[PDB]
Design a protein around this nucleic acid. Structure first.
Lengths: 78, 89, 95, 18, 103, 66, 78, 104, 92
DNA sequence: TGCCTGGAGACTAGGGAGTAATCCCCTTGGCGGTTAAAACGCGGGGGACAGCGCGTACGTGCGTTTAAGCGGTGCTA
DNA sequence: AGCACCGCTTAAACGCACGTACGCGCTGTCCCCCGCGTTTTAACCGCCAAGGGGATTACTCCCTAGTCTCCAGGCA
């Protein structure tokens, strides 16, 4: 149970960067599930690329390709 | 030249006493062409990342597992594996 | 001396829209990531830049979702965000 | 015992293999 | 005999092999690849036509129409995910009314 | 058809059109407008109303990415 | 002004297909502008493909290619 | 022995772009003006984004250009925001924006 | 192993428009990713345009059409102008 | 049905990929120390939600008007 | 095949009348989230060490492109 390691002040700081002034008490269980669906899609694609590349190690280019497949296009990691 | 007679051959095996209109035949033609272009483009992308010069049943299988959903991709991999097993034996 | 509720909230909005650092800690996120990954292939090993890219993409996704959540909450003539605003944003977004 | 208007089907003919 | 008779399929193999060399994908297509892709296309075609035939029998008809294709695709969990950004001509929408509007 | 020809005079004078080329435009335009109203009705229900406002259309086009 | 040819009961009929029960009085003037912007974008890309292909008639495959460029795949006119 | 970049008057290379066109499975043949045209377009886009990045670096009283300056330079221009509307920049942050109803 | 880059070329572009301004490695990597992404977009659109008209050669007309479809507004006008100016000087 | 154009059957050469060896870089595991950050109460002011009243804007219905379809013909880009 | 014209019909658009359901404004209450203070915990830095797998090179088999001949599958 490591999705409880995404604490309440961290979600509150992400909401303060998002512009939110006042926060209810039920946002956190929704945000953890949304984060654990987005992770469970990107790591699924990254482990598929790794399992095709005949590799023991998930690199960063697999993650960049997994994000490019979904339309995210992250810059800064090659 | 199209896939119309092959769509008729597939349709007469799952539902014998039925027909199909020409508009639905054109929609099935567009569907077959779109899925062909998607799988061929993803298999062309997979062969460049590993610096290989080809495309192979492993490449097509990896392009199927990335593109199709969970219950559909398993049956697609099983049908393709059975068809490529029957080709050599 | 105490601040009236909202002044510290706007102060945090101003300082975290000014800063550029990461907000989620690294070891809980890494333990979350290493636990999710093993359900796709056996014996997974990680570089540092893969998790460093996952954390950037995850926080960018969450900030981009809370912006539309705030827009839905303002459209509903409120200030407090609610889970139904998140559900409306993810329904209109196409997810 | 009851049927719909055939015009519904007339607007989209069946594919002709020839 | 043809290779579609060897593999036991119904879609052709030589046309798929010709479209793989011809469409500039790699300096080389492999082999088992057109047979594998023809099996995948035949399975997907048979699934679409099976659900379209069920949707056509549900309305007392004997000819599959684009409305029957629309209902067959949109009334399935995974085909709607595969074809979410596709607009079918003469297809229409799904009948649904929100529960806060009915008296 | 007159609207499409009028807005197509702004890009190239003395053009010519087919019939399926205007039919495809009409299909795409009707599907786009139906999807826009399907999201806008959800916006208006979330705003606790029945009548549909232009602010709901602007909210739908803002959240969608347009 | 052929934008007034898209009449009020046509927009009302599109809203009845979209599931809308009650309509205000500015939705028509909003919808005309939205449709105008969308059609200007698609006609601009279609005329670009037509001028590239050295033709003078605008075929339907140019419209299908422009709709694919926007990201809206259309089955039937191929 | 002059190069083709000196003959075209550009700063980006031409032979590397020609090698990447010939070794990338795009077509069978490659014309002799296409890498010159593409290097001109890439050099123009590079100078266009670096002008705004240098303006942001002068505005924030700095000497070097940082990803925050690149983020401000892209998101403060409308055409670059439309061209790069699906791009996430690492260590770039967001824009300062507070709605007018949240503050008294 | 020796690997391709664009860092010296981005530095040569930067030392013309701003004679006194540095650049960091993170910003140089973002610029390399930007150049690679725009290259892939224009080359893919040109290779898609080359197949519709049943041609085999990608030329500057296909590259110009791929630029005109992909860049919005006056940026496409200036890109076409710069490219035509660079192709005109190459032949002479 | 005509037939013809694309698909099958052998044979060969050359380079592409599969196997084995070995380096050494980088990933994983562990122990301690500091302190910043997370966790837990607590009082209170502010906002979400419910109830009520009112005026108007948008619905349904009927009579008149208008131009969208529906054919037929011809010329030419 | 696309554009231009022509005659006819009739179904859809427009305009006006009227009534009532709903959007908006006001008020009251009470729950609940926020600022603040104190205590507990594990994140982060620093250092160390074992060893597993990425990466490169060399050799060799075998797989597919190319060419020639033959002949039937499918499209009007």
């Amino acid at each position: 149970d490591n999705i409880q390691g995404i604490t309440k002040p961290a979600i509150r700081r992400l909401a303060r960067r998002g512009g939110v002034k006042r926060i209810s008490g039920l946002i956190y269980e929704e945000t953890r599930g949304v984060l654990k669906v987005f992770l469970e899609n990107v790591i699924r694609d990254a482990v598929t690329y790794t399992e095709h590349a005949k590799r023991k190690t998930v690199t960063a280019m697999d993650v960049v390709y997994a994000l490019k497949r979904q339309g995210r296009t992250l810059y800064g990691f090659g | 030249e199209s896939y119309s007679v092959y769509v008729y051959k597939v349709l007469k095996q799952v539902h014998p006493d039925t027909g199909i209109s020409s508009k639905a035949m054109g929609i099935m033609n567009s569907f077959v062409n779109d899925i062909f272009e998607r799988i061929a483009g993803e298999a062309s992308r997979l062969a460049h990342y590993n610096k290989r010069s080809t495309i192979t049943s492993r490449e097509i299988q990896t392009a199927v597992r990335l593109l199709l959903p969970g219950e559909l991709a398993k049956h697609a991999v099983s049908e393709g594996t059975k068809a490529v097993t029957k080709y050599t034996s | 001396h105490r601040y009236r509720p909202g002044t510290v909230a706007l102060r945090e909005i101003r300082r975290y829209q000014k800063s550029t650092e990461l907000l989620i800690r690294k070891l809980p996120f890494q333990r979350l990531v290493r636990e999710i990954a093993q359900d796709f292939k056996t014996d997974l090993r990680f570089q540092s830049s893969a998790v460093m890219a996952l954390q950037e993409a995850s926080e960018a996704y969450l900030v981009g979702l809370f912006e539309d959540t705030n827009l839905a909450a303002i459209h509903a003539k409120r200030v407090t965000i609610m889970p139904k605003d998140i559900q409306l944003a993810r329904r209109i977004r196409g997810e | 015992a009851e049927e719909g208007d055939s015009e519904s089907e007339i607007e989209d003919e069946t594919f002709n293999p020839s | 005999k043809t290779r579609s008779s060897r593999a036991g399929l119904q879609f052709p193999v030589g046309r798929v092999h010709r479209l793989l060399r011809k469409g500039n994908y790699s300096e080389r297509v492999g082999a088992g690849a057109p047979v594998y892709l023809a099996a995948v296309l035949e399975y997907l075609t048979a699934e679409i036509l099976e659900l379209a035939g069920n949707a056509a029998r549900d309305n007392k008809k004997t000819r599959i129409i684009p409305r029957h294709l629309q209902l067959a695709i949109r009334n399935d969990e995974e085909l709607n995910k595969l074809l979410g950004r596709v607009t079918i001509a003469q297809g229409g929408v799904l009948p649904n009314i929100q529960a806060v509007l009915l008296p």
